Every structure is written in structure tokens, then in C-alpha cells.
Amino acid sequence: ASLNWSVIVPALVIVLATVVWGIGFKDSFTNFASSALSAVVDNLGWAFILFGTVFVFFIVVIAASKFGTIRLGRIDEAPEFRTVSWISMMFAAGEGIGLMFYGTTEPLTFYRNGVPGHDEHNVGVAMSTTMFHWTLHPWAIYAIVGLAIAYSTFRVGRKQLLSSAFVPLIGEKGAEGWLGKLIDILAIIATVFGTACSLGLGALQIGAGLSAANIIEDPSDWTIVGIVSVLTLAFIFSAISGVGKGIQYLSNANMVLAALLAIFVFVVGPTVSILNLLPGSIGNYLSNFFQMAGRTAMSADGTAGEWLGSWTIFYWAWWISWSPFVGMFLARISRGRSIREFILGVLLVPAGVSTVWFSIFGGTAIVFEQNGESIWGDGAAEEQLFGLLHALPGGQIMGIIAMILLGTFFITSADSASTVMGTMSQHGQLEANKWVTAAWGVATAAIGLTLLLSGGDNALSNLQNVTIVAATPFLFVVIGLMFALVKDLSNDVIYLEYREQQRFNARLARERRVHNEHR
Amino acid sequence: QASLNWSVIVPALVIVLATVVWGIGFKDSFTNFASSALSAVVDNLGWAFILFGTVFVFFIVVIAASKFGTIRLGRIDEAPEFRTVSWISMMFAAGEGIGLMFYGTTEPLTFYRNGVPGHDEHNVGVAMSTTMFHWTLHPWAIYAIVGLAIAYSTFRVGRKQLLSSAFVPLIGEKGAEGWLGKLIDILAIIATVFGTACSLGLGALQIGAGLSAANIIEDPSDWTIVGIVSVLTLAFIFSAISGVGKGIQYLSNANMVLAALLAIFVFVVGPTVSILNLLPGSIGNYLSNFFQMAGRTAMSADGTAGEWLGSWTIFYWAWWISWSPFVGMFLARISRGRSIREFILGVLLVPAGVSTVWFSIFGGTAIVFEQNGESIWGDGAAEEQLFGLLHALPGGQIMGIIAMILLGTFFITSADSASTVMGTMSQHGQLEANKWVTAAWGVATAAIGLTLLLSGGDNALSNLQNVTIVAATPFLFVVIGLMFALVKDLSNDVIYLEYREQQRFNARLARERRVHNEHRK
Amino acid sequence: SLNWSVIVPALVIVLATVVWGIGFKDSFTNFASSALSAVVDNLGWAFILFGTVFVFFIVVIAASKFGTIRLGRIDEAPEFRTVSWISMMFAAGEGIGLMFYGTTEPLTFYRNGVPGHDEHNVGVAMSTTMFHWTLHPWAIYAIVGLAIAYSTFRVGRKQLLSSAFVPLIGEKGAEGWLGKLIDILAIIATVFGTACSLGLGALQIGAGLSAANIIEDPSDWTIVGIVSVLTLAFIFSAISGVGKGIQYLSNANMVLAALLAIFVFVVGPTVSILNLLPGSIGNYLSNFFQMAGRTAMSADGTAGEWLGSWTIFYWAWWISWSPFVGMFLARISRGRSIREFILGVLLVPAGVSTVWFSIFGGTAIVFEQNGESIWGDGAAEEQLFGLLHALPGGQIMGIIAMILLGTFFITSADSASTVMGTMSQHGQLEANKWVTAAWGVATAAIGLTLLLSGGDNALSNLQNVTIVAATPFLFVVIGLMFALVKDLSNDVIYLEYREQQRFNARLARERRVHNEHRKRE
Ligand SMILES: CCCCCCCCCCCCCCCCCC(=O)OC[C@H](COP(=O)([O-])OCC(O)COP(=O)([O-])OC[C@@H](COC(=O)CCCCCCCCCCCCCCCCC)OC(=O)CCCCCCCCCCCCCCCCC)OC(=O)CCCCCCCCCCCCCCCCC
Ligand SMILES: CCCCCCCCCCCCCCCCCC(=O)OC[C@H](COP(=O)([O-])OCC(O)COP(=O)([O-])OC[C@@H](COC(=O)CCCCCCCCCCCCCCCCC)OC(=O)CCCCCCCCCCCCCCCCC)OC(=O)CCCCCCCCCCCCCCCCC
């Protein structure tokens, strides 16, 4: 296919504008980001918080309805991936960097400071509200988007694009018109900013880790961590060949290293306490699910707005911005699966992986805090993991391994996001241009680095603010995608013979009633 | 022309007239009896109300989710005679309107200011959740049960449009025409009269408060209430005896338009952002606390929630059970040809969402005022809350008048609809009843409401609530039996006969086989 | 023929326990305490997690397509009427345990509170009593009974725990060493769970005799006499070769339990109990997942001892009872569907337990609130009679409760012994009466051994040894889930579609790999 320049040029111009604003005009960019966060949070926290749970309800009911039997492909089709392989391939979609960053920080900071409507030093609350942001809502969003693309491209044979999934609502004219172009541009921009958030978190934490081992300098975030991890691997893996064979190796190394780190912290750490937190975390998450889903700026006597902006609305925006990439990824590896099976796997397997990960790491941190040891230290979120690792025997080698894992996650996430963006910018071609992929990867890495540099001391806050503002337009795209998906599922070939009969009988009944009214 | 059911008219008419005379000429005796009867009823049946109120919700969810959800309310492969949008629009009628207007400000504001048993004061989430508790799912679960029973009896099986006909599976045709069916219909008419009189009394009281606030009348004297009720009853009487159904549908459209206008005015001129924040908060805290409130009895809070329960939750239970004949028959009428699952889902969810939005807007504005220093509580009279809320907003002087007009139109339309259903139930389930019987029933409900308001005196809302609870207690058992009748009716469907006969035959064979095996050794 | 390879190890372990307990009491008690500490600290997480995984698993199995499978031949209707089947679920379950903890558990939760909650809270006191007795125990029993019933009726295998693992180990492991190990573990777990029940019954009977002033004070010789008398009546019933006396006792169990519950209901605070019914159910559904998430590091690392005393003990007790109740449920529930079986087994005993605990615990808590108090010296065994004597006419009801405990002793012994004889007779339903008598005597001896060894801390001894003996069978019950899923998936009604899916998926994988290789060009 050809390049959709009408969709590349707008998004690329927006990205260049954001980068120039952040780099050359740090103060103005930071002020604007703070003001836009204030306005967006105050005026649309209701939208984020309401539709986060509407997505979960919607995907659950879609799975449990008659559409669950539909198969993503030809009728009576069987899937191309084994169930074990299908489950394993979902690891590459999850947050390697997000988990590596927040596994220790989030449960520990919620244990220490508490959350709105709750007191400090509550393990159940800490683990439950860590599981709130990471288990069902993100993967309900991802299931919705991936199911939309899967039904559009496999069942109906349309192009693999976000705009195509809206064909039921806006028709073909809209899909090829200005509205389809707008949807595709918003998808590309949201993916860019959502991936740049992860790249910024990973670079920040890698710098902190290098400082922990005492091998770092000050400008390493810009001069080494970003540009090296981008150029020396991602470009040479993309531009050199269609498949560089390094992405597969790194995607397997991610699994191996994450398993090794989790097993180290599990065995060397307080194993019994972690095993106690498994059922405790799951039970206290299921108990507090709706209480946390109803936490708005009007909660805790109006004092929850700042916390929600810093913690919950940030995650809403982050997951919404991830939606296009993760949806395309899940759709690509789920052909032939049924809708019910797809939804169940996508919702539950990563939820369990996240639950276990947070159990190990947050539980070790909370147990240390309870005993008297404090991995908190200064309080930086990027230094908690290495403090936790160093607190355990043989922690130096594992800290180095954690830095290696962070670098591999950086490379893998950037490469996969660039692949999906290139596909979306090339009229839905599965194998997009290599140079378009490299350009989009450069753009994402540059945006993440620019957010970090503009934030400076408050790098994390600047990152979160720009992610929150950048994902506001795509929240409505996902909301309308729910409607488009329902309208597409209803108008399935298997249901048309029943729908015509229902329409005919309803018309007969309505005309009979109208005639009786005339009488 | 179905003959008049005099044997069902007289037992309910005599009770209504006895209540009117007793409450008018003997205000003190009537109030004392109502108070004592509330004490006894609440003490010895709050467990029944609270348990079966949630059993209704569970029963409806199970019925929709079970194999019965695919059955059509009519002949097989039938289709609805109303478009889905028209069905949803018609659902708004037969709701409260007057209850929603009366309580939208008062109830969440009251819970926020004073708290609820087992919880502390100044809790927005708890106030909104326990307001949603009384107005969203258990109400419409009860209405779905009754309307589904009536719809199945009348469309699928082709019986009369009655509540006794829904008990045929339990007591049979002889029972339906026997004394038990007559008793069920009498209780249905009594419950309709008292559930309607409660809303009419609330509307008259709030219109009096509005006239007092608008300065049209200096005070809301008893004669003011009498005049309001007389004028509104005269309007309803003219609408009915005129024999033309155009004016009533015009007033229904006006009710929808004016309710939307008031909601939009408070949403826009009020704290829009807080109103929108309270939507997810209200829903989440409702689903979080659902079973905590479902398990709230007089034994909660170390045995101290009895007075609060009788004031709010048991009163609502009685009110929503008293409405059950009217709202059930209304929903049954407009739901021809729908499947059981579709009927249940729409009836449960659409009104719940509308109530959620209404309470969010009005209660959230009141609570936002409370938090910011302003207090529309004033003297604390419930009837004066709404006009305190509107008069605290720019341009609200005219919207208070619009609120009074909306209350008047709600009064007229609700009286007409309830009286139409009552006339149906007193004429062997005729779809259209005699004009004079409908007029008489509507005037009787108005007279009961006026009697309650006047006998209450300085405490009118309390007397209204007490009489509502006492009058609705008998029909809780009718609804409970209707659950069994509905299950038996759905089980004995034509599509399920062959499978059931196969199972019965095989079961007899297996039982004789095991009896023989025991005989062996 | 006797499976001596299974009898001899179980007999050796049981006799070793008896010799250790009587001969060396200090050593036995020290080992029991140390083993309780170790197993609790290291596997309370396993107990707590899998107790709720069982509920999730059985609910999902009932909901899924497997719920349509019929236990037996296709179109085979059940042998017992639904009334008979429902009533037969009372013989299997817990009568002695219910009588022992009917008052003690809610009363002590109300008095002392539970981890993460304040004391003197009726809602939690009843919700966490319902937690330990309603859905987790019966989820375990339903899983085990369903596995046994499917293996023995659908597939025609022998009625054993070993034959239910055939999906995982083939007939080679079913008859190999692993099947023998599973059978031995099932026998030992049944012996020790039934011994825990019998020891509780003997303690309660001694407490009742002390209360009735028949004995001046309890003594070890009194417990020995009680256990000897009851097991002698048992041995006579078993060796007599006539089950008429046992059927009489099993009916007397229901009659007397219903009589006692109705007495406490009518003569106790009826309205408070009725209030507690919906309160208990609602607070159970509200707090279900908060109680399911209670671990050794809840309430700031202070719930370990409370969990070991209450929650982990009940988990171990149910897991040790699971072979018996599973075999019982499989025997009486042939021809049922998986969905019907699961729903009935989960819901009927849960409702019965809810009513029982509502009555007795609500009576105790209402006495505590009003000013009275049945706590007395704090002994768990003395609470029930302390509750009875507080009510008028309780002097006779104390002896009625003692008689009921004796009948429960005999009948529970006989059902457990019959299951053990079936296990040791290669799954033969008509178990040898001498093996049955030997197993019953061994159970009584183990219960007496735990009581005597514990002495003053008799209940602690019982619970410690029960947890230790039930720890091994937890993994068997966990593996039953996988074995049952493999049984159900590989069913004749699904094998054709499974073959079609396998072939199509192989074609799809071949296409994808060939396409990838082609594109790799
Ligand atoms: C924590 C919370 C938890 C909550 C959990 C919630 C979870 C939900 C689970 C959902 C599961 C669904 C699964 C089953 C689906 C099966 C349905 C189906 O299709 O079966 C056929 C079944 C029957 O079919 P039918 O007989 O043909 O029906 C006729 C159609 O109704 C009449 O035809 P039509 O005119 O509609 O035709 C239009 C056509 C296609 O439409 C078009 O013509 C499209 C035109 C193009 C528009 C542009 C689209 C492109 C936009 C993309 C986004 C871009 C953004 C970019 C951003 C840029 C920023 C810079 O659409 C359709 O195909 C019909 C579906 C329309 C759905 C309408 C529902 C509106 C909901 C309103 C309430 C909620 C709003 C929330 C507001 C927020 C605050 C609360 O369909 C229906 O169910 C239809 C009825 C649906 C309900 C209608 C409701 C009307 C208004 C309700 C208001 C009152 C209630 C709300 C609360 C109270 C407010 C006061
Ligand atoms: C105090 C509160 C509780 C405290 C907490 C404790 C928990 C409560 C204990 C519950 C324990 C579990 C259940 C045990 C019951 C076992 C028996 C049974 O019903 O199962 C066998 C049941 C019947 O089988 P069967 O015994 O073989 O029947 C044929 C025999 O030939 C039988 O031969 P037959 O045909 O001659 O049998 C007689 C009858 C056919 O049925 C019978 O066998 C007799 C009636 C059945 C007993 C029902 C027990 C279970 C339900 C509890 C009732 C209350 C709440 C639920 C309401 C019912 C909705 C299903 O047929 C007739 O000829 C009609 C005779 C008249 C019937 C009664 C009519 C009067 C109703 C009473 C109320 C009226 C006014 C006073 C109001 C009261 C003051 C508060 O078998 C089935 O499974 C059939 C299923 C039918 C369709 C299922 C779909 C509907 C279910 C919806 C879900 C409900 C949600 C509720 C959840 C709420 C949670 C908060």
C-alpha cells in the first residue's frame, strides 16, 4: 500500500511542535502543561473515571452475550497460535517498564501515605488500589480496542486501522473522509505520547539504577540512557532488515529476566509474607473494586482531586493512550479465537501476572517498612526498586540485571509501538515501511526525552501531565469505538436472517397499532 | 363492554371512604392509630420488607438470566408494537415525578447533613449511594416482577388484564374467580389508591411550599392545600369526563419537557463539574454498599436503626410496593411483544439511570452548597428544599414557577394514569374503562391524599408515610406469592412441555428401579 | 476382597497416633503444637487461597457447558425426588460441629471482634460465622462429590478417590503406588476429621452432663465412659447387620435438631432473629471478599493466631471431611445434572446453616446486649446449655440436646465408617461389616486420644491434630480440580467437536508456519 501522508503530516507536525516547545521553551511548556492538567482534570475527571469502569462493564457483557460465540475470522475457523503460545505472547504487550517502575513504589507509597478515604499503614488497601490501576481496567480498554480491530480486519476483511472500525457509524465516506483521517491522526498521536511516557519512565529508572551502582554522571539521561538505547539497538534492529532477529531474542530475554528477578525477590525475600499477600491482594481488590471505581474529586470531602490527578487519572490517560498499539498487537496474535475466549484471556492472564508481580515486589517493600527497614530513603520513585534489591543478599548483580531488563523493555516497547504506528500510517499494511518505523520510533523517543528534560526536577510530574493532556482527545475515540463495535457485531451475517424477520414483524405490529390509533 | 366488578369495587371503596371520614373528623385518633400501626408493622415486619426487597432483585436477575429470558410476551415470534425509543420514552411516565421532585434535594441533603445508621455525617458517597438505594433497582425490580407477571398472563396465555389472573398457576381458574382472586384484586386497588395518594399529597404539600416561597400566598395554610387539591382534581376530572385523550398526552409531553428543562437549568447554572463528578461516584458507591444496605435492619448499629429505617427505607419499600399494580400494568401494556430478558433489562436499567442523573444533579447541587457554606436547609422543612435550591441560583425565580407548574402537571397525569389502571382492575381487566369509574377512583385517591395531609397537621409528611406503610403491608405478601406464581407459569410453558414430560417419565422409571434394588437387598 | 495395601498403612498410622497420644501425652501435645505452628505459618496462605478458589471453580463449572452434563447415562433422571434428595443432604454435613459452634462462634466474634474490625459488631460477628460454614465447606464437598460421581457413574469406574485421578495418572497410577497413596490419605483424613467431630461431641456431652448435675464435675473417666458407651451402641448397630436402627437414628437427628431450633426461635427473641436473617445474608455478601482476603498479615500482622484458631482450622476440618461428604453426595445424586447438583449442594446447606446460626448466635448476642450473658467461664463446650438454661423450659431442652449429640455421634460414626469400608473394599458399596466396625472403633479411639492428650487444652489439641492431619489432603483436593476438568472436557458429547477443533487448529498452525517461512524469503 501507499503512505497516508494526510495522516503522517498532521501528527508529525504536532510531535515536532511539542518537541520544540519542550526543548527550546522549557518554562512555557511546563507552565502550559500544568495549566492544561488543571483544566483537563477539573473538567473531565468525571469522564475518565466513569468511562474507565464503563469499559470494564461493556467488555464483560460483550463476552457474556451472544457475541462471545463469534470467531475472529471465517466461520468455523480455528486459531493459528497454541493457547500456551498465545498466553506467552501477551507478555510483550504488558507494561514491562511500568511494572518495573511502579512495582515497589505504588504499593509502598499507598501503604505509607494512604489513599483518599482511607488511613495510613493498611496493607490490604495498598495492594487493592495497586491492583485497581493495573489489572482489569487497562485490559478492558485493550480488549475493547483489540476486539474492534480484530472484528474489523478478520471477520469483515476491512483495513487494519482505527478508522475502519468506525465504518459502521460513519460509513465508508467518513472512513475515507476527514473524520477517518482525524481518528487515525488521534490514534497515532495518542500512541506516540503513551509510548513516550514509558520510555521516559524507563530512562529515568535506568539513570537511577546506574547511580545506585555508582557508575553514572548527570547528563546520562540525555547523553547515554536515551540516545544509546534508541540508536544503538532500535534503529539497527528496524532499518537493517525486515526482521533483525534481535527483537525475538530481546522479547525472550524479557521473559527470562523478569522471571529471574521475580524468583530472586520471592525466594530471597519474605516468601511466606508474599504468599499471604497473594490471596489478600486478590480478595481486597475484589472487595474494594467499586469503592475505588467511585472515587472522584468529590470524595474525601473534596480532597481527592490532587491524588486522582497524580495517580488514577494519570493511569486512565496512560492506558487510553496505549490503547491503539496494544489493541493492534492483541488483534494480530488472536485470529481465529472466539470473542469470549479472547476477552477472557486478555482480561485474566495479564491481571494474574500483574497481581503476582505486585505481590512479590510491593509485599517485600511493605514487609521491610513494617519491620523497620525503609527502602523509601529520599523518596524518589525511580530509586525504590534498587533500594529494595540492595536490601537483600546478593542484590548488586540483581540490580544490574534489573537495569538490563529495563533497557530490553525500552527497546522492545519502542520497536513494537513503532511497528504499529508505521502500519497505521501506511493504510493498514501489516509490514510497514522500515524507514517510517524508524522515524516514528525516533519521534517517540525524542518526545519522552523532551518531557524529561522540560520537567527537570519534576520530570515525573511533567511526564504525567503531558500524558494526561495528550490522551484526552482519544478518550472520546474509544467511547465512540464502543458504539461502533456494538453496531458492527449486531450487523453480522449470522444475525441478518433473524434481523430481517424481526424488522418485518415489528413493522407489521407498528402499522397495526397506528391503524388502530387512526380508528 | 365488560361488566363492573361491584364485588371488588365495594370492598375497596368502603375502606377508602372509612379512611377519609376517620382522618377528617377524627384527626387525633387517626394519627394515633397510624403511629401505633407503624410501630407494630415496622417492629414485626421490617425483616420481611428488607429481606424480600432484595429477594425481588435477585429473583428478577435470575429470571432474566435463566432460560426464561428468551420467552416473548405474546404469541411466539411476535415483535414489539412500539419502537424502542418510544418504549424508553414511555417508561418515564408511571414513574414518580412528584416523588423525585420532592426528594431529589431533601434526601441526599438529609443524609449528608445527618448521616445514616452505621456511618458518619458529611459523607457524599454514602448519601448518594443510599439515595440510589431507594430509587434505582429494588423499586424497578418490584415493578418488573409485577409487570412481567401481568404481561405473561395477558399476552402469552391470553387471560384478563388483572392481578388475580397472574395467580391462576397457583390457585387455578376457580381460584381466580373465587374469593382469593377477589381479595387479591381488592388489595391491589387499595395499594394503588394509597401509593397514588402518597404522591398526590407530596405534590400538594410541595406546591403549597412553592406558592409560599414565590410570595403568591403569604403562608401554606390548610385552606391553601385544600384549594390546590381541589383545582388539580377539577382539572383531572375535566380531562377524564371530556372523553378526549389528547389533553392527557399533551400534559405528559409537557411533563417530560419541563422536567428536562429544570434538570438542564440546575445542571448548567449550578455546579456542573461537581454534578458530573457525582455520577461515577454515586454509581460506584451504590454498587460498593449495595449489600451493606440490603443487610441493614433494626439490629444494625447495635440495635439503633429502627427509627431511621421506618422513616426512610421501610417507608420507601411500602411506597414502591403500593405502586406495584399501577406501574406493573402500565409497563405490561407498553411491552407487548418484547422478550422477558429485554423487558427486565429495559425496565430495570433505564429508570435507574434517569433517577441516578436526577439525584446527581439536584442532590449534588444541594451538597455542593452545603460544603461551600450556603445552606438551603433553612427551617428544615422538606417541601421547601427544592424552592430553596432554585431560588439560590440566578434566574431561579421563574424556574420556581416552572417547578410549580411541573408539579401540577405531574399531579394531573399521575392521578389520571393511576385511576385508569384502577378502572381497568375494577372492570374485569378491560383495556378501556368507564369514564365515571375512572373519575371516581381518581377523586378518591385525591381525597385520601388530602385527608392524610390535613389529618397530619403540623406533621403531614409523617402521617403520609405511616399510612403508606400500613396500607402497603398487606401487598408485600401478594408480591411474594406472585413470585411463585410467575415461576410456575414460566415453567409450564408450551415450549417446555415435552422436555418436562420426558424428565418425569425417566424419573418415575429411575425411582421404581431403585425401589426394586432396595427390595432385592 | 480387602485392599490390604491400603488398610495396613492407615491402620498403622492410626494405631501409632493412639499409642503416642495415650502413652506419651506431653510428647504428643508438644509435637501437635509445633506442627500446628509450622503448618499454619507455612501453608495458611494455601488454605486461604484455595478455599476461595474452590468456590470460584465450582461456580464456573456450574455456569459453563459442563453444567448441562447429566450424572449417569444421557436422559437418566435422578433416582430420588428433589425433596428426598434435598432432605438427604442433612445426614452428610456437620451436626455436632453446628451444635458446638452454634452459639460459641458468633458469640465470641461479637465479644472479642475479628481482625480488621472492632468488637461488639453484630454484622461482622454473623458474616464471619456464615463465612466458615456456608459456601467454602460445601464448595469443597461439591467438588469432591462431583468428581466421584462423574468417575463412578458416567465413566463406570470404581467408587474411589484414586479412580477420580485417572485423567492424570491412567489406570497404571490409579492401581499403582500413587493411587494407593491417594486412597490412604483419603482414609486418614476421613478418620481424623470424623475423630475431631466425635471429640467435639464427647466434650459437648460432658459439658451437658455437668450442666444437668448428673455428674458433679467432668473427668477423663467420664469422657472415656461417654465415648465407650456411644461406640458400643455403634458397634452393636453395625454388627447387627440391620440398618433399620440407623435409619431411625438418622431421622431422629433431623426431628430433634428441628425441634431444638424451633424452640430457640419461638422462646427466644424471634423478631431479633428474623432481623438477623437478612442482616446476616447481606453482611455476608458484602464482606465475602474482605474475609476471603484475610491472611496472616492482615490487621498489621496480628491475624495469624486468630486464623489458626478459627479460619485455618475450619479449612482443614472441611478438607478432611471432604472424602466422606463427597462419597455421600455422589451416592445420593445420580441422574442429576452437574448444574442442579452443584446449585442444590451449595445452596440448601448454606441456607440451613444460615438459619441455624441466626437462631443460636442471635439469641446469644441479644442476651449479651440486653444485659444477660451466657459466656460464663468462657468454655466453648458450655455455651449452648448456658443458652438453653437461660430460656424457659431449657432444663428439658438440655437433655434433648445431649440426646441429639449422642445420636449425631453414632450416625456420623456410621456414615464415616461406611465410606472407609468402601474405600478399603476396592470401592465395594456393600462394605464388610467387620471392616466398618474396625474403622468406626479406630475413629472413636483417635477422638478419645486427642481429648485425653489435650486434657485442659482439649480443643486446642483437637484443632492442632486436625490441621496437621488435613494438610496432606489439601493437595489431593486441589488436584481433584484438574482431574475433574479433564474428566468433563473429555466427554463423549464433546469428543467429535474436540477432534474437529484439533484438526482445524493443526491446519491453521501449518498454514501460519508455512506462510512465515515463505515470507522469510
Ligand atoms: C460505572 C457505570 C457502569 C455502566 C455500565 C454500562 C455498560 C453497557 C453495556 C453495553 C452492552 C451492549 C451489548 C449489546 C448490544 C446490542 C444492541 C443492538 O444493537 O441490538 C439492537 C437493539 C434494537 O435495535 P433497533 O430495534 O433497530 O433499535 C432502534 C435504534 O434504537 C434506533 O436507531 P438509531 O437512530 O439509534 O440508529 C443509529 C445507529 C448508528 O448511529 C448513527 O447514525 C451514527 C451517526 C454518526 C455519528 C458520529 C460517529 C463518529 C464518532 C466517533 C468518535 C470521534 C471522537 C473524536 C474526538 C475529537 C476531539 C478533539 O445506531 C445504532 O446502530 C443503534 C444504537 C444506538 C445507541 C444509542 C445509545 C445512547 C446512550 C445514551 C445514554 C448514555 C450516554 C452517557 C452520557 C455521558 C454522561 C452520563 O438496539 C438497541 O438496543 C437500540 C436502543 C438502545 C438504547 C437507546 C437509548 C436512547 C437514549 C437513552 C437516554 C436515557 C437513558 C440514559 C440515562 C438517563 C439520561 C437522562
Ligand atoms: C425466612 C427467610 C430465610 C432466611 C435465610 C435462610 C435461607 C432460606 C432457605 C433456602 C435454602 C435453599 C432452597 C431450599 C428449597 C428447596 C426446594 C426448592 O424450591 O427447590 C426445588 C424446586 C421445586 O422442585 P420440586 O420440589 O420437585 O417441585 C415439584 C414437586 O412435584 C413438588 O410437587 P408440587 O408441584 O405439588 O409442589 C407444590 C408446588 C410446587 O412447589 C413446591 O414444591 C412448593 C413451593 C416451593 C418451595 C420454595 C423454596 C425455595 C424458595 C424460597 C422462597 C422465598 C424466596 C424465593 C421466592 C421463590 C422464587 C423462586 O406446586 C403447587 O401445586 C403449588 C402449591 C403452592 C405453592 C406455594 C404458593 C404460596 C407461596 C408462599 C408465599 C405467599 C404469601 C405469604 C408470604 C410470606 C411471609 C414472608 O425445583 C427446582 O429447582 C425448580 C426450579 C423452578 C424454576 C427456577 C427459576 C426460578 C428461580 C429464581 C431465583 C430465586 C432467587 C432467590 C434468591 C434470594 C436471595 C436473597
Ligand SMILES: CCCCCCCCCCCCCCCCCC(=O)O[C@@H](COC(=O)CCCCCCCCCCCCCCC)COP(=O)(O)OC[C@H](O)CO
Ligand atoms: C501465577 C501466575 C499466572 C496466573 C495467571 C492466571 C490465569 C487465568 C487465566 C484464565 C484463562 C484464560 C485463557 C482461556 C482460554 C480457554 C478458553 C476459556 O477459558 O474460555 C472459554 C469460556 O467458556 C465459557 O463458556 C465460560 C467459562 C467461564 C470460565 C471462567 C474462568 C475464569 C474465572 C475468573 C474468576 C475471577 C478471577 C479474579 C478476577 C480479578 C471459551 O469459550 P468458547 O466460546 O470457546 O466456548 C467453549 C465452551 O463451549 C464453553 O463455553
Ligand SMILES: CCCCCCCCCCCCCCCCCC(=O)O[C@@H](COC(=O)CCCCCCCCCCCCCCC)COP(=O)(O)OC[C@H](O)CO
Ligand atoms: C453509562 C453510560 C454510557 C453507556 C455506554 C454504552 C456503550 C455501548 C452502546 C451499545 C448500544 C446499545 C446500548 C443498550 C444496551 C442494552 C443492554 C443489551 O443490549 O443487553 C444485551 C446483553 O445483555 C447483557 O448481558 C447485559 C446488558 C448490559 C446491562 C448490564 C449493565 C449493568 C449496569 C449496572 C449499574 C448499576 C445500576 C444503578 C446505576 C444505573 C441483550 O439484551 P437486550 O435487552 O438487548 O436483548 C434481550 C434479548 O436477547 C432480546 O433481544
Ligand SMILES: CCCCCCCCCCCCCCCCCC(=O)O[C@@H](COC(=O)CCCCCCCCCCCCCCC)COP(=O)(O)OC[C@H](O)CO
Ligand atoms: C442462602 C439461601 C439460598 C440461596 C439464595 C441465593 C441464590 C442466588 C443464586 C441462585 C441461582 C439459581 C439459578 C437457577 C437457574 C436455572 C437454570 C436452568 O435452566 O436450569 C438448569 C439448572 O437447574 C437448577 O439448578 C434449577 C434450580 C432453580 C432453583 C433456584 C433456587 C434459588 C434459591 C431459592 C431460595 C431463596 C431464599 C431467599 C431467602 C433468603 C437445568 O438443570 P436441570 O435440568 O437439572 O434443572 C431442572 C429444573 O426443573 C429446570 O428448571
